[PDB]
Design a protein around this nucleic acid. Sequence first.
RNA 1: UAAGGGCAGACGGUGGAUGCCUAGGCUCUCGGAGGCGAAGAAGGACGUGAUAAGCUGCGAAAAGCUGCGGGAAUCGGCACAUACGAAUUGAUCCGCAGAUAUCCGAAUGGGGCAACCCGUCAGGCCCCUGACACAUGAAUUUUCAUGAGCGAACGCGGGGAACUGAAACAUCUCAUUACCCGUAGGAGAAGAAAACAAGUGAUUCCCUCAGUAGUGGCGAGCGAACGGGGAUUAGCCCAAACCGGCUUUGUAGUCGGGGUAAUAGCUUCGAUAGAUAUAGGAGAACCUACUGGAAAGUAUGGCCGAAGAGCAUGAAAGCUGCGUAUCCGACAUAUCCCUGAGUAGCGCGGGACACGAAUCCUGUGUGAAUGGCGGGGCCCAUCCCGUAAGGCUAAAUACUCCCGAGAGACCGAUAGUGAACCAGU
RNA 2: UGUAGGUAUAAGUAACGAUAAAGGGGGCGAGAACCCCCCUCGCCGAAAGACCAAGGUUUCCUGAUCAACGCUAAUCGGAUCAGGGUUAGUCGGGGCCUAAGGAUAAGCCGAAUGGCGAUCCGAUGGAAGAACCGGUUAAUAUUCCGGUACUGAUAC
RNA 3: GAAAACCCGCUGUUACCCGUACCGUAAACCGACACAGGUGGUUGGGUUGAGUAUACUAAGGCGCUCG
Lengths: 63, 95, 77, 103, 48
Amino acid sequence: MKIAEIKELATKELQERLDAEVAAYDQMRINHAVSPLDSPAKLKHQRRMIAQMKTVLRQRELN
Amino acid sequence: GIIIKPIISEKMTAVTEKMSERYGFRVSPNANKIEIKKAVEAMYNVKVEDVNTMRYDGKRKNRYTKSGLIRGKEASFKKAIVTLKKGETIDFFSN
Amino acid sequence: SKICQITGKKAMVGNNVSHSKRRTKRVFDVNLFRKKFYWVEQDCWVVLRISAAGLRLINKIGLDAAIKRAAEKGFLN
Amino acid sequence: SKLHIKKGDTVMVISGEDKGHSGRVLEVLVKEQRAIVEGLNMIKKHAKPSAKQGGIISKEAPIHISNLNVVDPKTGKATRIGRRLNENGKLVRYAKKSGEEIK
Amino acid sequence: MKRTYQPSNRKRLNKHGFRSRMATANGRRVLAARRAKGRAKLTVSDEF
RNA sequence: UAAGGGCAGACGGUGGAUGCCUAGGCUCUCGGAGGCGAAGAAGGACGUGAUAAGCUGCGAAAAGCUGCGGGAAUCGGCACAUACGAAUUGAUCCGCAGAUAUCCGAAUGGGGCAACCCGUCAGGCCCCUGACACAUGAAUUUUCAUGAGCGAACGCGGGGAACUGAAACAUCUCAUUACCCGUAGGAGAAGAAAACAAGUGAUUCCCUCAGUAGUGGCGAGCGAACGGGGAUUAGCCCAAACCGGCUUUGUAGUCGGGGUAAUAGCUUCGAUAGAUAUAGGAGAACCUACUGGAAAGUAUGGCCGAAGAGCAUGAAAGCUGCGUAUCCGACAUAUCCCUGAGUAGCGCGGGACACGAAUCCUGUGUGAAUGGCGGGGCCCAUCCCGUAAGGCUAAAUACUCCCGAGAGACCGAUAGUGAACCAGU
RNA sequence: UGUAGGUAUAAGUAACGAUAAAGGGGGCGAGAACCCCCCUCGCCGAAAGACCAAGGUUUCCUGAUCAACGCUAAUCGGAUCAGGGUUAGUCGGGGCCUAAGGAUAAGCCGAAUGGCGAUCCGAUGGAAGAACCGGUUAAUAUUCCGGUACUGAUAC
RNA sequence: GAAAACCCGCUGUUACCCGUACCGUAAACCGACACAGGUGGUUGGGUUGAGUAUACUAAGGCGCUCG
Ligand SMILES: [K+]
Ligand SMILES: [K+]
Ligand SMILES: [K+]
Ligand SMILES: [Mg+2]
Ligand SMILES: [Mg+2]
Ligand SMILES: [Mg+2]
Ligand SMILES: [Mg+2]
Ligand SMILES: [Mg+2]
Ligand SMILES: [Mg+2]
Ligand SMILES: [Mg+2]
Ligand SMILES: [Mg+2]
Ligand SMILES: [Mg+2]
Ligand SMILES: [Mg+2]
Ligand SMILES: [Mg+2]
Ligand SMILES: [Mg+2]
Ligand SMILES: [Mg+2]
Ligand SMILES: [Mg+2]
Ligand SMILES: [Mg+2]
Ligand SMILES: [Mg+2]
Ligand SMILES: [Mg+2]
Ligand SMILES: [Mg+2]
Ligand SMILES: [Mg+2]
Ligand SMILES: [Mg+2]
Ligand SMILES: [Mg+2]
Ligand SMILES: [Mg+2]
Ligand SMILES: [Mg+2]
Ligand code: NA
Ligand code: NA
Ligand code: NA
Ligand code: NA
Ligand code: NA
Ligand code: NA
């Protein structure tokens, strides 16, 4: 997802999706350690997605 | 989040061949046994029977530049040997 | 904080001077002592670390006036 | 800083061994201020059979960008370019030799 | 023969450690001077 | 006969001199700014990349996250890397505003061998983890506000040497220096006559007065002020008499608050919003020949100039590139009757004043006056000047860790900083 | 008896660090007195064997490498590079307690910085709540496994 | 010929944290060195002996990095 698709979601759905993507990122990291993936940049994309999600959640929490 | 990577080595391969319920992970140095058990259970949907831990200090290494030598060091880590319940398993090759 | 609580007097620095004008560092000390006073206006007893000059001021203007003056000038604490 | 040439532009070499030859720009190295022009400044590299069978490989080496000038779309000649906001409020490159927008 | 340096980690930290330096006004003077000089090793606590 | 040796030339070896080069130093100029920190600093520890991290950046959201403005094709930091991706549905980057921001450290819940150990109370999970609170001290009435620590120089204050000079040395000098400690601010201190003088008119700084008057084992030395010329310019406010309000206390008083009154060489009461800065936009004008690996060189012939500063480019470029002169440009966020009492004065012992015993200060002991009182180099009389024992006050002055822009008949790698690079390593 | 760097002379000299000692046969290798295996010989044996603590900090094991380091050479190494390797309810420590001493409270003293001063800190001491047997790795084992046990909290 | 804590009397389900490699009368610690020195505690078989002396010798370890 991109930043617009993230900001389109509601707070509860965004929360559930963030907890989903965190576990997905952990599994992806373990898999990349086991066997290097064809595209390592998927990990970086997931990491930045998690950061963007937390930023939006904080913006809503203090706005 | 504390699980960094699994341990693939001859010793771990032999241990898993002899037990089949025993796996190894490299985890954060400051996680305790209960935290490791909960993280493994949440990540793999299994029942964890026992956790053994050992703390490894990182190796000191030499960084070689054009001029000469710089002393450096690798990061410290913790090894977690996890034994599951009878009949359970974890797959590292799949996915 | 060895210092008079009524006048603020503290020790001075000076010289011993011999007949051949040799000068050696010295301290002029305050004639300081602890004394108990009956405060009439508050009907109680107080203990003050004062000099003989502070006692002269107390015997000149009364204890209450001396204490209020010292508090105003900051000597009391 | 914005450069006077870009990838996909037709340029003319105005100084050096390849002076007087035109070509297409394949890549721009901004930090070193150089560019790869297709077909020009060929070098022979002795490549080991490591690969992945070696040999002598001919390939283009970069040229300094102050040696390259945009080819004028009218007369096909090297020229200095300028910039103006004629394209609907957007800055565009144009050739001072003629005036046509560089494209 | 017995030489002058007989190592003891407990004594080393008790004598020259960071907390020993911070406990005294002159030790803090030493720390300030070393920071001003720009030492990478502030005290023996930094060493290993 | 040269085992070997001597001298010269040629050619090599070693070593790294020399020449040429450098943004790394050095000294300054102008304009700003002059702090950071309990909303957790300076300085560190540990982490963080697709791949080990030495630096750099960043902090479990970890070479990064969000918004607005600018810009337009590459970007994914450096130590001579590739892969793999991002990006015209506008990445990267730049300005401004936000989000996150582990542990130690004033470190502040208690301890502790810094980066660790152990807790209590409430709240959400299930032995064990995540978010709070829980230090002290002076103010305030449990709440609230401040403080603590670090840091360049300059300011003020408390203590305070010696070597040295005197051709020895003790008075004296070095010096109210070094150093230790405390504490402010953008400056600080001083400042509005109980003054200098023999007419001037608050402080501060500069040039003179002047190495003069003085002071001094009258040795070595130390060393003013008045006046004059400038920089700058600024003067104000309390206490008391008296009149009312409240409270308290004594038996109409007497205090203490707040209000009026009015403060002195002489009196007094009473009778600004536009601009600036922090990103940016445009920005003139060159051909032919020769030499050459390569022209910017040379020779021709042209053009621009409010632009002939500079740097880069395969040699030295006004017309190749970035620029330069000039003009334009901001969504934000910043900046602009009374008159001062343990006083004036005095004795003893000392100190600071240029001054080694008038003016000023005081450890000890004393002690007035209320027209009166103080000074004019010791004391007296006259004369003159001033009005102490309450307070505040800009400018002209001092400085540079930091930021921006500049400069040098300063250095050019054994030089210049210790440090041009892996440097306080 | 100046300073830095570089290079000479003495000189192919002194010396190669305990007079416990070596010989042979095979292996590998381009290269062997020295490396690996075997036989023989010799030295220690209240140690020159086996353990705990302090201190060190990857030197441990394996694969590559022989430039530098190893007072010779080296195919070897405590050397260079990379990978691997340390597993605890019962062992040791810590968590608990106090000693010397240290930091402090109320207070005392003192130009400043501060100096003292009964609760806390502080083991080298006191408590710890609690086992052994056997097997297994290239490198760990009272920790892993098979038996056999025991201890502390917690829900009936 | 310590103190204080402490301790007396008056059937499941779990078991946290740190150390654990290797050297350690030494080539890995203190001595600039792979240095004839220094380094606390335990164990230390057989014959001989009063003996942990002495001589020889198991287990184990070494022949001391120039010939
Ligand atoms: K453990
Ligand atoms: K000599
Ligand atoms: K061991
Ligand atoms: Mg000859
Ligand atoms: Mg020569
Ligand atoms: Mg977070
Ligand atoms: Mg504390
Ligand atoms: Mg003399
Ligand atoms: Mg131009
Ligand atoms: Mg130019
Ligand atoms: Mg230098
Ligand atoms: Mg000599
Ligand atoms: Mg000889
Ligand atoms: Mg010798
Ligand atoms: Mg010899
Ligand atoms: Mg032994
Ligand atoms: Mg080994
Ligand atoms: Mg090998
Ligand atoms: Mg050798
Ligand atoms: Mg090795
Ligand atoms: Mg205790
Ligand atoms: Mg072993
Ligand atoms: Mg030895
Ligand atoms: Mg014994
Ligand atoms: Mg025996
Ligand atoms: Mg014996
Ligand atoms: Na000869
Ligand atoms: Na704390
Ligand atoms: Na421009
Ligand atoms: Na040249
Ligand atoms: Na040991
Ligand atoms: Na150790």
